[PDB]
Design a protein around this ligand. Structure first.
Ligand code: MG
Ligand code: MG
Length: 87
RNA sequence: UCGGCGGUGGGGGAGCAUCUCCUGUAGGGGAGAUGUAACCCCCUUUACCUGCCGAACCCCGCCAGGCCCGGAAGGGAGCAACGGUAGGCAGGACGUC
């Protein structure tokens, strides 16, 4: 499964790729945070910094690949809650 | 003769904008709500047709090449060009003074 940072970017609107509602979204989210959250969830994330999201093909944002067999949107919601939840 | 003003409203269907959701282990596929002038229709019983300017900085659509995701197939955002709107100029049977 791929996770594009735009999915949870609070700066982006839905048309631009945000898949998460405003109150969970993270402003300019980091792959370092995305990866940390996924590991906390028992998964094996792998960062690819070279990749660009077609909706913003000029912006070298990278992405995270993790083998996941559950609901995608719901994992994104969980990732966000973990990130906004570091003590 | 001159001369002066004026350019309707309304319901739908798109598409788009933003938000929220469902879904697909990339790109993506869909729903709803609120907004909308741009496309289509219709509705009437007066508001039509002209060329030509016009969004230089994002007003909307659309988009060659390139760029992106992809082994490919396929998709995506999208600059130029191209089409339009708001709006200006000239005119032209039509409303009014
Ligand atoms: Mg092309
Ligand atoms: Mg390739």
């Amino acid at each position: 499964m791929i996770i594009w940072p735009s999915y949870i970017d609070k700066k982006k609107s839905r048309r631009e790729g945000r898949k998460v509602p405003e109150e969970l979204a993270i402003e300019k989210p980091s792959l370092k945070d995305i990866e940390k959250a996924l590991k906390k969830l028992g998964l094996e994330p792998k960062i690819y910094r070279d990749k660009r999201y077609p909706r913003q093909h000029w912006e070298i944002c990278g992405c995270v690949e993790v083998d996941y067999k559950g609901n995608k949107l719901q994992l994104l919601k969980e990732i966000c809650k973990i990130i906004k939840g570091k003590n």
